[PDB]
Amino acid sequence: GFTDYIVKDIALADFGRKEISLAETEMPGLMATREEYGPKQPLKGARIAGSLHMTIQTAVLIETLAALGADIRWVSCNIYSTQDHAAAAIAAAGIPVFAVKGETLTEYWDYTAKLFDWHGGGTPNMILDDGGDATMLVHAGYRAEQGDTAFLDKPGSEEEEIFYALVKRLLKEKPKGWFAEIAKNIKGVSEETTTGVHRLYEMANKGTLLFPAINVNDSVTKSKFDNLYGCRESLVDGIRRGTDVMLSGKVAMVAGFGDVGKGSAASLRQAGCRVMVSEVDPICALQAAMEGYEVVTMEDAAPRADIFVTATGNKDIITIEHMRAMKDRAIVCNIGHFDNEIQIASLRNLKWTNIKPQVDEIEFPDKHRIIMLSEGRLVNLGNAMGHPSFVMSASFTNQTLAQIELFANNKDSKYAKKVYVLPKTLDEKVARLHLAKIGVKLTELRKDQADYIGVKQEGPYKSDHYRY
Amino acid sequence: GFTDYIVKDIALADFGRKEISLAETEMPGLMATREEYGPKQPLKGARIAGSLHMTIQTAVLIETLAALGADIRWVSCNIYSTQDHAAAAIAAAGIPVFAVKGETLTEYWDYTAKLFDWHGGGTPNMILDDGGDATMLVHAGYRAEQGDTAFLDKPGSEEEEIFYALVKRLLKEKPKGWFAEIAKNIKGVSEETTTGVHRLYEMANKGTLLFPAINVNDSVTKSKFDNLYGCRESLVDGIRRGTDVMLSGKVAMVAGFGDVGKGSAASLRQAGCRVMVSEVDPICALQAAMEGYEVVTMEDAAPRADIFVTATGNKDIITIEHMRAMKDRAIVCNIGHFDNEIQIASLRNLKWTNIKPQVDEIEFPDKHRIIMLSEGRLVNLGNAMGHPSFVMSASFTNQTLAQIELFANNKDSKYAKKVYVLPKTLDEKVARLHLAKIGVKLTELRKDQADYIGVKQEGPYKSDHYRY
Amino acid sequence: GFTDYIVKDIALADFGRKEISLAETEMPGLMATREEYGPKQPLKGARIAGSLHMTIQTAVLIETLAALGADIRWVSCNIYSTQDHAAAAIAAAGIPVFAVKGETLTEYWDYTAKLFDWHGGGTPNMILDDGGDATMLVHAGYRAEQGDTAFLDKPGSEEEEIFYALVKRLLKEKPKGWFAEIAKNIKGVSEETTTGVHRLYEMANKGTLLFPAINVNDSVTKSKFDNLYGCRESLVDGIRRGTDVMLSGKVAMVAGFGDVGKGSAASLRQAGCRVMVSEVDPICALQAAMEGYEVVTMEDAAPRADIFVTATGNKDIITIEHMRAMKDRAIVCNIGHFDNEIQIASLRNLKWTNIKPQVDEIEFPDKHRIIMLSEGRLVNLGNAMGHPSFVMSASFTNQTLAQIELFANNKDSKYAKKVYVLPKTLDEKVARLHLAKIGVKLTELRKDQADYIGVKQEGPYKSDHYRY
Amino acid sequence: GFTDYIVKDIALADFGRKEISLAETEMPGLMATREEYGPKQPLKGARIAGSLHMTIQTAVLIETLAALGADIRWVSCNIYSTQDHAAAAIAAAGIPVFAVKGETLTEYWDYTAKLFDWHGGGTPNMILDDGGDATMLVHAGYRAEQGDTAFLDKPGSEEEEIFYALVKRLLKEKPKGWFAEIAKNIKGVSEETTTGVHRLYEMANKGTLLFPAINVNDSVTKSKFDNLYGCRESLVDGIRRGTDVMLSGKVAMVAGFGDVGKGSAASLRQAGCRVMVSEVDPICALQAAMEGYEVVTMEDAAPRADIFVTATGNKDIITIEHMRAMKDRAIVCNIGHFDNEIQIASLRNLKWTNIKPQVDEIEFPDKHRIIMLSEGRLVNLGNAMGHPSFVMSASFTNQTLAQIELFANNKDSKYAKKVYVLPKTLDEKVARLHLAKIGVKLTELRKDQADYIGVKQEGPYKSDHYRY
Numbered sequence A, B, C, D: 001g002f003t004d005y006i007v008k009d010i011a012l013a014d015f016g017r018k019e020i021s022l023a024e025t026e027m028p029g030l031m032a033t034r035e036e037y038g039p040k041q042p043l044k045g046a047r048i049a050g051s052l053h054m055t056i057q058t059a060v061l062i063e064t065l066a067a068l069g070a071d072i073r074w075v076s077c078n079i080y081s082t083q084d085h086a087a088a089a090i091a092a093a094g095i096p097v098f099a100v101k102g103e104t105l106t107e108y109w110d111y112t113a114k115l116f117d118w119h120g121g122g123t124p125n126m127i128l129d130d131g132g133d134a135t136m137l138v139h140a141g142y143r144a145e146q147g148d149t150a151f152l153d154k155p156g157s158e159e160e161e162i163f164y165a166l167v168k169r170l171l172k173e174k175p176k177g178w179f180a181e182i183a184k185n186i187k188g189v190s191e192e193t194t195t196g197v198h199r200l201y202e203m204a205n206k207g208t209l210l211f212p213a214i215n216v217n218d219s220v221t222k223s224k225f226d227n228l229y230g231c232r233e234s235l236v237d238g239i240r241r242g243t244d245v246m247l248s249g250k251v252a253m254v255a256g257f258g259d260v261g262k263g264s265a266a267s268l269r270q271a272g273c274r275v276m277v278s279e280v281d282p283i284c285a286l287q288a289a290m291e292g293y294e295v296v297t298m299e300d301a302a303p304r305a306d307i308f309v310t311a312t313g314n315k316d317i318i319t320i321e322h323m324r325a326m327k328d329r330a331i332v333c334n335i336g337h338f339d340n341e342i343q344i345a346s347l348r349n350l351k352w353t354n355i356k357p358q359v360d361e362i363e364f365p366d367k368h369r370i371i372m373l374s375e376g377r378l379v380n381l382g383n384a385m386g387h388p389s390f391v392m393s394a395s396f397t398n399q400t401l402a403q404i405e406l407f408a409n410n411k412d413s414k415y416a417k418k419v420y421v422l423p424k425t426l427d428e429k430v431a432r433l434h435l436a437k438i439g440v441k442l443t444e445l446r447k448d449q450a451d452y453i454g455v456k457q458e459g460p461y462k463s464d465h466y467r468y
């Protein structure tokens, strides 16, 4: 009967379910959230369109939202990040999901569009986003629909051209006013990642943001955990699964020393690499120098590093000029959200030899080769399994609490068409939910100790400005 | 010739000059400040009263201020922290300084008052403060001079009696209106410490703050170096100098995991200890757990750890009950708040045996002993040498740019009678000034890249909410 | 065409060749050995029977032996360690290989026996062994063939029942005297691993060793590189691929702190675990303690560790009683050569649920579960890809040099029926061949300095009993 | 004795005693040895001449030897290594000691000679040596006494000149045959350090060794603990006390990656330095590269490192050409046994400015300076306190046992005029004595497990060639 999904192979559902069961044990924050909020059904009547890597971890999130009352449609936010067994389990549970590892860019955007065609008619009333692509579709569509169609005839990348072609097709095919109808019905968006959050604040600042938004990335229990420790665990996992290279004895270069760069550099250092870093920000650079990382330019690194990782959220970090200078069989990859950190398109006239899924060897006219991972897309999710469940539990608890805020706790319009963050009390609660599983025994302040440092015994323990 | 100083012994000057020269090499931020800002002489006409630990590192700051054009008078902000050779080199350079290691509290206050007797007869026009004592003298005198004198007759302590007696003395020995003359001439204060900033925010809230203030404590470069990196460099140094214990093998317990506890745990783990941590903040606790530290209560640690370090800023962290349970010759020290993390008064009826300065052995009735460092005062200052010069360069370069901001960049009254923090471009500038010496090569954004991430090429590169 | 092989799927050959090409770049020792010895063909006339994990790295070894003139037959030395694409590449090159990932124990032993059926008739004249199974088949058959057959009726396990049945089958199906013919024709064996080497010294001390043997494990460039750094890279790789667990925050227990145990503890510690160790040797225990590992018994660790790894080469390290006490979903695995470190057979009456290949969940009557990796067989090879190519280049250059010594350099009978180690000049040469690839710049002793410390400028640099 | 000693200040005895008491708790090996052998008095009749750094740790060894029945005379084996409180405590206990921190080379050698003038007449009958100076005095005097005197007129250093003048003075002043009488009466020497042991094997090879010798350095519980973990603790201790520089981010260069260099590199990396190494031995170089150190020549390092440490046992490692190329205020030191690793003599025509004890600034004609620690003598002992007590307990338990072997257990002449090492049974015993203090619980093999791996349940657990 149920056919409203696109997955690689529904027979993977049982395997998916086994690994989802294992992840539940490792995701105490999600599981406690189900227990606390299940009886309250705060998401009853929510119609959540999610665009977030369709992994086993995400499957636990999906089922949490469903356990709280939500009706759901889902897609991945990257073409290579889906775990097909996870997608199959979600589909077998009767939830619409459109996600295949190795789907094309065309497919990616057609699937994103399928979020907004709700079963039984109508549209979503919430978005849960990672990177802002779903949110961008609604806003670009609404822009074009109100008459400003000129940006669509003017593409400047392959993905961008596919995107514009999609918006034109929806405008042609859907009823008139369809983007405005969606816009009107979306009660809020919660956004997972640094790149997506930037896109939000750009819209808020231009006055074009169409609905309230919560920035989940800037919870301390997301940015200082997921971005940092998740990358610490999953960067080298992606490199090893892709290449099986010996990391001890190698020189690695990491571009960027923000939250993800700090994690990435650590990942490699802990695996035995001698790590160099680039930075444009002098504070971040000084932080890298204080951890004993050599801070150099990509020009200085290009001829000598064995492994290159972009972690900036910026564009044109590793250029064709750098790659021409690289040693034979240098490994290149990207852990930032989008592939344009590396000039992949500049390599497309060269000879590519596919080694295996998400691993390609690219040969230059002088016969030197480079090893490219996931065609420059997120290496941790492309070549491995992304961040482990325990850390994603912290991120996804924050997401769930964000969806509850926007969907259930905005009766008094406390959330306007602006970008908000979760309050410290909720940030601390998320951490508190993860302590027992890892055997942490938290100290309780006596009343006089609490008074002495100016806090309540139950928190919050730190000012909103505190950097951790 | 020059006689406007009070020091232990002016014959120490040559020795002081030799140590200052060595420090300069390790204070590149200050020395670069002299090079870059010297040509414009932005502190020409500044009359700076400084109250800050009269050490060799502070002398390099003093001479940097003078190299930028400033006329200066100086005192220590603490009776014990003066290095007499540093004071003597400053006096021998023709700069009024009133600082002697081990001066009385009465002398401490009379010397503070001498800041305000400018050569030629005026007052200072800038204050550079650590702890707020100089700023408090001005505010207390002003309050009294304006007719509200009752508070001067109600001292809470011996120290307070001495301060109040000083205020009374200045009201009789200086002209009517002297405190109002000082307040009208002070263009700003820059304050380095939490106790001093707390005092500023209390006055600003009560509408009693007499001039603009910059909170230097809050900058990323100041807080990280003073709290994190300085303790990371100096905690184990103090333990070794005091005890010469082998740290490999040993179990250490660190109470608190904010910036000082982070640095302290790291210092100990680096040195080979198996480190446990206590925390009351679930976020900090989760950070400690994710770094591989066992998070336990002090009751669980007490019978177990070989070394204890308090780093909380709170009181009654290590109690008599804990110390009764400790193993024989456990080492106990404090790196946090100046006093009363450890219940030192509770040990007052036990047998104390002095080993050497700042190291005592305490015997209990059951005959187990503990080794106490610095009588439970700060171990990095009592048993070692405090923060290394490079670390102090970060803080003092912040101070220098704050003095420039208030003295030279307030023509348009951007700084009113309120408490401000240094804007991010100056926090970034502090980092920039240290990069050449530590061997960092920074990357410059191209125009399209700066556009892409929504920053100017020259910074600032992060929002004011970014946590690093 | 050529059909003398058993592999999973010959169509994997192209994939295998691509990864073999990638491995060659990472294996400068083997590639330099080909260049040096290829013209002299020192293995022309060798008939090498290899029993060693049929991985991509081993494929480069096989092709090195062939380049030096050897005729070869190959099998894996573990039922789960074959890399099917490697096996397929070797079969497609026309080399007999009998190796499938996930072969049964019966297949395993029948394949081992196929080594000795040389193409055209007759036997091998060299053995290259890892763990001593091939060598044991020859000695056991010889023992039984000479009249001593009682041992064959007393199996101590399923594997032993199968092995004895094989020897019985061979004594019936092969000509009378076949084992003695094999024994007479084997010029030597080189042995890779600690366990196989122990088996060789057992036979040598008993006077039963039938041919000369080189102990390759005790080259410094093997034991202090491949056992140590190889496990440091590959243990956590196995655990991540099998479980995708978050290691930061977890407690792990490693049984053993010899070379493999040292590497294994480091693997886990570098990945973020709090690591405990067991040991029987007080020197190795004290080393673990000085490196900051908690040293405890398995009974102490059993209820509390999240991950258990056996690294001893001994038996009955993790017993049914331990496993009954483990926390729900503890992970258990083995990186020692044989599976009897864990009592897997004691688990066979419990409920086993397969998760995916080499990952099983086992449920006890009280409903707690454990996650078992590779059914207790080598986790690094079973759940991941074994040690990376670079470190295996050192081990396999030693192997190649040992095969040359026994096959080509024994005309004067310098190698009798005893166990030998390669000399320090060859061990230093193996290290030298790897320096350029990793960017090491070696210092040359001035003649006066060489004289001063009593070495030649070209080495050797250390005494034969130097421990590195 | 009452009179028979030279120390800096006998009034320091009480302080010395307090630190000795504290060290005893940290030295379970020595205290266990006193407890076992004190009642057996195995050293009764021994007259031990000890030449070993007169530190607090040595004071515990001396008092152990005395508790075992020994009569003792002692000197330091380095001019800057004495801890004057330690020396004073020994003098106050009535033991002849001639040791002052900062004694001259003339005094050093005169004090060594005093060893041999036994109180009450006669000579020692045992030597305990660290570096071989006491042993060299006997052998050089013997050589000259037997008629071969020409060498005494051909010194190659100032220290040799002093040494040869001493040998001449003794031949002139002592009775005819004095060196032959000493040589006859010495029953053995135990030697602590790698350089001293090299001196012994050289005498043994040329047949000039006059008495049996035990190489203590090559006990596993010495070489793999003291040389390695001791330096890991004490190298950075010396650099910090000497200089107080911030170590995070500094680049350091370590010459040598043997036991001491491995420890030294670890010391600096653990303190936050980015560490480079040099080596001549390709195996040791490959070890350094695999641990992530950049392996470079001193020529490459000279212009760029901030800190240089020589750890080779060789000479002319840091030449005047290297030092001319160093950056201003680079720090230079030596942790090898003698002051010729650095070309200190070539610096003597330059301007030296003393900073504090064991710290000097040397200015070159182009005005760049370097910071020299301890005039190029052992930095850990000269600028700090040497290795901490607990690891010295391991070395000094080996020494005590070696003294017992040579003095009490040579009735059957199992020890000839050659160099021996202690058996593994004793090496293991030393490790066992330290386990309880550090909290190790050792696992006990069942009989079947001991048989399975070919060891006795009580050990030894490893073959004599095992490298740990």
Ligand SMILES: NC(=O)c1ccc[n+]([C@@H]2O[C@H](COP(=O)([O-])OP(=O)(O)OC[C@H]3O[C@@H](n4cnc5c(N)ncnc54)[C@H](O)[C@@H]3O)[C@@H](O)[C@H]2O)c1
Pocket (backbone or CB within 6 Å): A193, A194, A195, A196, A226, A227, A230, A231, A255, A256, A257, A258, A259, A260, A261, A278, A279, A280, A281, A284, A311, A312, A313, A314, A317, A335, A336, A337, A338, A378, A379, A380, A386, A387, B443, B445, B449, B453, B461
């Ligand atoms: N699992 C993942 O792969 C994962 C997880 C979290 C976030 N992300 C993505 O990673 C990217 C980075 O996120 P973040 O949270 O670390 O951002 P961040 O702002 O904390 O850090 C980025 C850093 O890049 C630096 N930078 C910018 N341009 C540079 C250049 N040309 N050269 C060198 N450095 C440069 C910045 O100064 C900044 O410090 C984003 O795209 C984010 O969405 C990925």
Ligand SMILES: NC(=O)c1ccc[n+]([C@@H]2O[C@H](COP(=O)([O-])OP(=O)(O)OC[C@H]3O[C@@H](n4cnc5c(N)ncnc54)[C@H](O)[C@@H]3O)[C@@H](O)[C@H]2O)c1
Pocket (backbone or CB within 6 Å): A443, A445, A449, A453, A461, B194, B226, B227, B231, B255, B256, B257, B258, B259, B260, B261, B278, B279, B280, B281, B284, B311, B312, B313, B314, B317, B335, B336, B337, B338, B378, B379, B380
């Ligand atoms: N020794 C020095 O040289 C030096 C330098 C800088 C700061 N400090 C001082 O160190 C102290 C801490 O500074 P900080 O910057 O780390 O502050 P912080 O606020 O960043 O961190 C303190 C931590 O202690 C924790 N805490 C509070 N009470 C606790 C309790 N009963 N048990 C366990 N944990 C508890 C808090 O949750 C907090 O995370 C302050 O007093 C500060 O002034 C000392």
Ligand SMILES: NC(=O)c1ccc[n+]([C@@H]2O[C@H](COP(=O)([O-])OP(=O)(O)OC[C@H]3O[C@@H](n4cnc5c(N)ncnc54)[C@H](O)[C@@H]3O)[C@@H](O)[C@H]2O)c1
Pocket (backbone or CB within 6 Å): C193, C194, C195, C196, C226, C227, C230, C231, C255, C256, C257, C258, C259, C260, C261, C278, C279, C280, C281, C284, C311, C312, C313, C314, C317, C335, C336, C337, C338, C378, C379, C380, C381, C387, D443, D445, D449, D453, D461
């Ligand atoms: N997985 C791989 O890739 C790989 C690589 C190399 C070696 N190995 C194998 O690993 C095993 C160990 O090799 P190794 O070279 O480290 O041996 P080793 O002899 O150096 O170390 C083994 C240690 O186990 C300890 N031990 C013995 N019984 C014990 C017990 N009951 N409890 C705790 N500790 C105990 C010993 O004291 C010893 O220190 C062998 O089977 C070897 O063949 C596997």
Ligand SMILES: NC(=O)c1ccc[n+]([C@@H]2O[C@H](COP(=O)([O-])OP(=O)(O)OC[C@H]3O[C@@H](n4cnc5c(N)ncnc54)[C@H](O)[C@@H]3O)[C@@H](O)[C@H]2O)c1
Pocket (backbone or CB within 6 Å): C443, C445, C449, C461, D193, D194, D195, D196, D226, D227, D230, D231, D255, D256, D257, D258, D259, D260, D261, D278, D279, D280, D281, D284, D311, D312, D313, D314, D317, D335, D336, D337, D338, D378, D379, D380, D387
């Ligand atoms: N300061 C201390 O407390 C302490 C403690 C133990 C030993 N020592 C002394 O330290 C020295 C070294 O001892 P060890 O046990 O490490 O010896 P080792 O033989 O284990 O190591 C010395 C290393 O120096 C290397 N080497 C030699 N010449 C070199 C050169 N020109 N450049 C670079 N590397 C070179 C060798 O290859 C060797 O690996 C000896 O003098 C020893 O007595 C000092």
